[PDB]
Swiss-Prot record, chains A, B:
Residue window of the full protein shown: 3264 to 3564 of 7096
Protein name, entry field: 3C-like proteinase nsp5
Localisation per UniProt entry: Host cytoplasm; Host Golgi apparatus; Host nucleus
Protein activity control: Inhibited by pyridone-containing alpha-ketoamides compounds 13a and 13b. In turn, alpha-ketoamide 13b (tert-butyl (1-((S)-1-(((S)-4-(benzylamino)-3,4-dioxo-1-((S)-2-oxopyrrolidin-3-yl)butan-2-yl)amino)-3-cyclopropyl-1-oxopropan-2-yl)-2-oxo-1,2-dihydropyridin-3-yl)carbamate) inhibits SARS-CoV-2 replication in human lung cells. Inhibited ex vivo by michael acceptor inhibitor N3. Inhibited ex vivo by compound 11a and 11b.
Cross-link (Glycyl lysine isopeptide (Lys-Gly) (interchain with G-Cter in ubiquitin)): K5, K90
Length: 301, 301
């Protein structure tokens, strides 16, 4: 037993990380088959970043402008193009360590593992949720750009995130591997803020099921409720609405414990109004919303 | 910026994990060079676990009682011996993925990454601390025995923990890779229970310094404390005594932030008296004690 925030084993991804230099910018690249993927803002000077014309800045560049280092070896860049906010550098050599992989776009409320990297060197791994406001609460310093997020499904790595920048509130914004931003953000030195965030309701309830499976049961009660009643409490407390889709996804956990989702919504309703009455749940004093139902079933079954 | 429980990239450890079977019992082993390390309890049956005479059980085994398996490949065992509570199986093949490694025994308060494994397959990675009562607060289901804990400082893998068992309070006990248990625990099914756990004071202080570095000042105060007055207060909250050693270790974070260690102690004393009054520090509503002074510097500017 026990319940811990757990990343996927990062080895299949560690073997894809490289360093990419263009002028006086160094950051991380993802090397799969004969392509390296990295943020397009790699081509930009501090001057350029205020109002970049990426079309124009990029035709002015050539293969020899991009320095790609896999460990202590140089990669010959033999082609370059841009897909959305992602730069694609064709290289002479196919990554001998390319795993089975897919490019996937994740939904708000879904989790993934981040492999934080510096100068193409894997540094750390942690789990993140894609917030409803389309930011993530990561841990990133200068040179972490091009670090990636992913899930693993048996042998297949599904890459879903590439890190681009930090917003002024300390939270993080990036693209899918097709270079489309998560959220209403631009890769340009301009005035940008994260929208007000909401709590991921289905994840909070997943975590309460994890708490019950681990013998933390005090918050339970004899009551039940309805979507409509609860959702009026949720909206007041900046909680995402709970749908019938959410209640079905939690079905496996409602069974395994004898607390039915609206039964558990009753407990959750009470925790929002009255608080935790000074207790903890799984060693947190907050209601944790970064574990999915899958995350809980995965770890507790 | 940001601050996260962050595990080391697990890749170098993943390439070392194998499955060990003896009788009807399967768990994980650690394959380094021509040696597979696993818990010796793998040779126990139902009766044996109450008073196992491990020397008597092992002499009755030959090499071919041990089925070892690296993915699909069977490894052939050609030798076995016991060192304390760890079984060492000699195999005909040296592991080609063997990283630069070493075995270190850690002290209470030290952190490491756990690669949770089932049937020799890595399942997830997370951070733990050796509690002052020599247990760890892990996430371990049946089959996870032989999972290891490690640091990776400067490309060398330091193995510090092999998982043996769960205590009735739902916390985890294991050995160093020389087979010596952390704490007074034993690999027999007898009435053993962890000591009362305490908070790792040096770690809480390091985390408060992390909070300041990341731009939080709300919990600072105009007070200081003697080291001795601080210890007489902190022990009333079940905090570990803070020693001159611990004060020395925080010197760098003191200098980086300009807050003297005993001033930060005055802030911790106040937080224990007051709580957080509906605020949070680095995303927590509790005082976190599983980040070392070294972890704070690795992750922070
Ligand atoms: C690399 N890149 C595009 C960035 O770092 N930014 C856009 C940041 C500058 C302030 S911001 O909030 O606009 C994000
Ligand atoms: C495999 N193995 C040796 C164990 O699981 N144990 C010794 C645990 C049973 C309850 S206990 O607290 O005695 C530890
Ligand atoms: Cl140590
Ligand atoms: Na109920």
């Amino acid at each position: 037993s026990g319940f811990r925030k757990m990343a996927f084993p990062s080895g299949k991804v560690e073997g894809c990380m490289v360093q990419v230099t263009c002028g006086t910018t160094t950051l991380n690249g993802l090397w799969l088959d004969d392509v390296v993927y990295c943020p397009r803002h790699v081509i930009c000077t501090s001057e350029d970043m205020l109002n970049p014309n990426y079309e124009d800045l990029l035709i002015r560049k050539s293969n020899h402008n991009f320095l790609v280092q896999a460990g202590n070896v140089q990669l010959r860049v033999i082609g370059h193009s841009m897909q959305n906010c992602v730069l694609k550098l064709k290289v002479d050599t196919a990554n001998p360590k390319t795993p089975k992989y897919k490019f996937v776009r994740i939904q708000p409320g879904q989790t993934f593992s981040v492999l934080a990297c510096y100068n193409g060197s894997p540094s750390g791994v942690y789990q993140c949720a894609m917030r409803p406001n389309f930011t993530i609460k990561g841990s990133f310093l200068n040179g972490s750009c091009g670090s990636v997020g992913f899930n693993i499904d048996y042998d297949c790595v599904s890459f879903c995130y590439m890190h681009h920048m930090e917003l002024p509130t300390g939270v993080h914004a990036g693209t899918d591997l097709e270079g489309n931003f998560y959220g209403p953000f631009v890769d340009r030195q301009t005035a940008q803020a994260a929208g007000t965030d909401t709590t991921i309701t289905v994840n909070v309830l997943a975590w309460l099921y994890a708490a019950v499976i681990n013998g933390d049961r005090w918050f339970l009660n004899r009551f039940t409720t309805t979507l409509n009643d609860f959702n009026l409490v949720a909206m007041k407390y900046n909680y995402e609405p709970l749908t019938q889709d959410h209640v079905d996804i939690l079905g496996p956990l409602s069974a395994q414990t004898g607390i039915a989702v609206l039964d558990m919504c009753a407990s959750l309703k009470e925790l929002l109004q009255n608080g935790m009455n000074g207790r903890t749940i799984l060693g947190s004093a907050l209601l944790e919303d970064e574990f999915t139902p899958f995350d809980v079933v995965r770890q507790c079954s």
